Amino acid sequence: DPDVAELFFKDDPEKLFSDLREIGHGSFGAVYFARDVRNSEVVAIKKMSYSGKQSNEKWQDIIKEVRFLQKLRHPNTIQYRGCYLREHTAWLVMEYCLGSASDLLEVHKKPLQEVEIAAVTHGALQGLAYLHSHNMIHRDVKAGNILLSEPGLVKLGDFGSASIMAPANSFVGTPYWMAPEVILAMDEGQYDGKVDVWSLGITCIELAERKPPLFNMNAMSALYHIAQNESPALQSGHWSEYFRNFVDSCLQKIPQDRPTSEVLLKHRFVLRERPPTVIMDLIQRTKDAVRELDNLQYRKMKKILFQEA
Ligand SMILES: [Ca+2]
Numbered sequence: 001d002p003d004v005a006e007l008f009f010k011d012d013p014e015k016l017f018s019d020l021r022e023i024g025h026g027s028f029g030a031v032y033f034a035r036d037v038r039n040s041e042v043v044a045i046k047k048m049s050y051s052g053k054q055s056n057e058k059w060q061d062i063i064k065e066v067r068f069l070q071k072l073r074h075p076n077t078i079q080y081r082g083c084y085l086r087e088h089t090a091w092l093v094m095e096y097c098l099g100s101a102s103d104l105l106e107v108h109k110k111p112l113q114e115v116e117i118a119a120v121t122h123g124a125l126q127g128l129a130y131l132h133s134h135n136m137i138h139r140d141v142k143a144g145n146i147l148l149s150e151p152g153l154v155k156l157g158d159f160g161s162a163s164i165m166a167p168a169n170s171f172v173g174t175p176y177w178m179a180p181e182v183i184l185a186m187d188e189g190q191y192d193g194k195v196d197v198w199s200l201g202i203t204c205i206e207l208a209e210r211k212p213p214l215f216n217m218n219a220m221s222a223l224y225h226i227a228q229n230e231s232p233a234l235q236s237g238h239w240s241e242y243f244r245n246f247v248d249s250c251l252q253k254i255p256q257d258r259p260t261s262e263v264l265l266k267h268r269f270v271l272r273e274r275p276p277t278v279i280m281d282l283i284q285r286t287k288d289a290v291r292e293l294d295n296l297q298y299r300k301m302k303k304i305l306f307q308e309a
Pocket residue numbers: 168169170
């Protein structure tokens with residue numbers, strides 16, 4: 001059992017974790033909030049079954065992600081804690097992040113404050129520059145994959161579409177956030193980690209406006225429009241120039257004009273001094289808002305307070 005013996009711990013996850021509560025799902029399967037019985041610590045577990053239809057590809061997806069996750073050692077990437085295997089289900093365990101940037105947008109039904117967008121953007125950017133420095137590409141940067149964790153850190157999540165080498169040429173990502181060069185690859189081309197810089201630019205707008213541009217058209221049309229049309233920009237003139245320029249820089253259409261994530265780490269938007277408690281306060285005000293939600297037991301965003309139950 002080659003990859004099994006190599007990549008997994010032998011323990012039975014069922015004896016290690018309890019209070020599993022679903023906090024997300026996708027084709028892979030589902031992600032869960034859980035409690036590590038050994039130290040009374042909360043963790044996140046992504047269960048990936050490989051029996052459903054055809055074990056084959058699901059199993060390959062599992063191994064690739066485990067191997068990818070094993071390589072990450074940066075504070076702005078989700079911390080991987082190991083994996084277990086039981087009944088055709090791989091349990092990938094990770095540190096727990098109580099919410100994504102997207103959940104934040106859903107709880108307040110309002111864009112984030114600019115200082116908060118800067119703090120979220122900066123953290124995700126650091127993670128991208130780290131991934132890029134090792135020639136990897138995330139390929140699915142969006143508010144839903146930027147996670148918050150206490151006491152107050154921003155971490156990149158969901159490496160299910162990631163590439164371990166640049167240049168890359170696969171059609172992958174989430175339509176509205178995909179860079180033109182990735183869509184162009186739809187024919188036969190290649191692209192950089194710069195595509196993540198583009199996706200980050202779209203995410204910045206999503207954090208400022210709750211949705212990415214083109215969210216009002218179907219996926220196929222958006223794809224055609226991203227490629228063949230001008231670049232979107234923040235629509236309100238009220239955001240500072242630093243933010244405005246940061247976003248327009250990320251959204252340069254031709255890779256060559258787009259800066260690398262490393263260069264962006266020196267951008268004024270990201271370097272402008274901000275209170276040291278921004279993320280922490282953002283999380284606290286979010287937890288507080290969720291507690292006031294009407295009919296909480298039935299509101300999906302209650303997951304933000306799972307660690308209290
Ligand atoms: Ca390839």
